Amino acid sequence: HHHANKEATRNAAALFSVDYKAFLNEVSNLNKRMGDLRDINGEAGAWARIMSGTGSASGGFSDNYTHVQVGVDKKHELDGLDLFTGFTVTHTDSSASADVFSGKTKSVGAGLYASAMFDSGAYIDLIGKYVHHDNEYTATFAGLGTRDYSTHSWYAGAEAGYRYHVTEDAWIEPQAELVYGSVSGKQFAWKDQGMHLSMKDKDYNPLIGRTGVDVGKSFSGKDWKVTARAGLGYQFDLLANGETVLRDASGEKRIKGEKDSRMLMSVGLNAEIRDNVRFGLEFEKSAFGKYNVDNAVNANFRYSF
Ligand SMILES: CCCCCCCCOCCOCCOCCOCCO
Ligand SMILES: CCCCCCCCOCCOCCOCCOCCO
């Protein structure tokens, strides 16, 4: 009984964890979503972004995702402050697998942001969104077969940082970010070998913290600019209030959520071409976590006018 129970627990936990990755895939930061929003003349904007990535964890879990996003905003000009207020829509296709399961998630989201760029070098970014997830996963363990189900998520994220110019052309930028969410629970009930089995998890609420530093060196001409940049951060769960319940003939079993944390590493660039066009690009990975991003690439483009 004990061996059987460990296996089921490991398998259930692996499967249900895709809901955790789903959520984490939609967490980003200002520079990754918007590019560099400093010293922009135009009073309106339209932008787009693509991210592609792969990650992994024990049990042979691997995943990779494609995240597409577009938004539009107005920039209000204030005393030493530009405040961008706008809307955004996102699409994510992700695929995932491990020793005992396989499948795909499809996500559509919408939201609202405000980004506040201060002349002093300070910034605040606030974002609220809703994401709807269609999921299809196939396991072989337990006789669970194929399962389709929906989930949804709410996101409320706040980021602050400060760009200190060490030289006319070199800079350092400490940053802090806090992202609060929700994730809908689901239940499977099925039969295997004449026996009623069951698997259910409650709604839960991620809180994800990040602290880090970016550093940058810029180069310019009259009608162009390029900044090379790099950065080191620490990303960490502050809660793990999820719980899965396994239930069979013999009895119940509760598996509680565990916190994960990882070190974030990245390198890239933001370009300015003439008056309306900006482009940003980063390569990223993480180290030291149960789940790490093994590599990912983010591109964004903004047209300001
Ligand atoms: C103990 C391991 C901690 C160090 C991790 C390895 C660092 C070597 O790679 C340099 C990464 O530079 C930062 C930018 O990362 C770009 C991601 O793309 C490369 C993925 O391999
Ligand atoms: C992740 C890609 C990193 C891209 C590096 C930045 C390249 C842009 O630099 C433009 C330099 O303009 C000419 C001045 O020369 C500076 C010497 O350093 C150039 C190193 O490539």
Q: How many of the other CB atoms lie within 10 Å of CB of 168?
A: 7
Q: Is 54 in the pocket of ligand 1 (CB under 6 A)?
A: no
- Those residues whose C-beta lies under 8 Å from the C-beta of residue 194, and which sit 6 or more positions away, are none
Q: Which residues of 148-163 are buried (b: 16+ CB within 10 A; e: fewer)?
A: eeebebebebebbbeb
DSSP assignment of 127-191: EEEEEEEEEEEEE-GGG-EEEEEEEEEEEEEEEEEE-EESSSSEEEEEEEEEEEEEE---EEEEE
Q: Is 219 in the pocket of ligand 2 (CB under 6 A)?
A: yes
Between CA 146 and CA 81 the distance in angstroms is 52
Which residue owns the Cα nearest ligand 2 atom 1?
268
Choose among 292, 202, 208: nearest CA to 256: 202
Task: Pull the structure tokens for residue 48.
Answer: 């787009």
Ligand that comes closest to the CA of residue 280: 2
Ligand that comes closest to the CA of residue 55: 1
Between CA 162 and CA 167 the distance in angstroms is 15
Helix (H) or strand (E) holding 31: helix 30-34
Q: Is 267 in the pocket of ligand 2 (CB under 6 A)?
A: yes
Which residue owns the Cα nearest ligand 2 atom 11?
219
Class of domain 1-305: mainly beta
- Cα of 267 vs centre of ligand 1, distance in Å, is 9
- Those residues whose C-beta lies under 8 Å from the C-beta of residue 286, and which sit 6 or more positions away, are 55, 235, 262, 263, 264, 265, 292, 293
> At how many Å resolution was this determined?
2.5
Q: Is 224 in the pocket of ligand 2 (CB under 6 A)?
A: no
Three-state secondary structure call for residue 23: helix
Task: Pull the structure tokens for residue 210.
Answer: 């990040």
Between CA 162 and CA 231 the distance in angstroms is 14
Q: How many of the other CB atoms lie within 10 Å of CB of 140?
A: 12
Say if residues 97 and 103 touch (Cβ distance below 8 Å). Answer: yes
The one-character DSSP state at 204 is B
What are the boundaries of each domain within the chain?
A: 1-305
Between CA 160 and CA 197 the distance in angstroms is 47
Three-point CA angle 135, 60, 183, nearest 5°: 35
Q: Which amino acid is at 51?
A: M
Cα diameter, the chain: 76
Residues paired with residue 266 on neighbouring β-strands, in sequence order: 231, 284
Task: Pull the structure tokens for residue 280.
Answer: 């940003």
Helix (H) or strand (E) holding 90: strand 81-98
Between CA 263 and CA 212 the distance in angstroms is 9
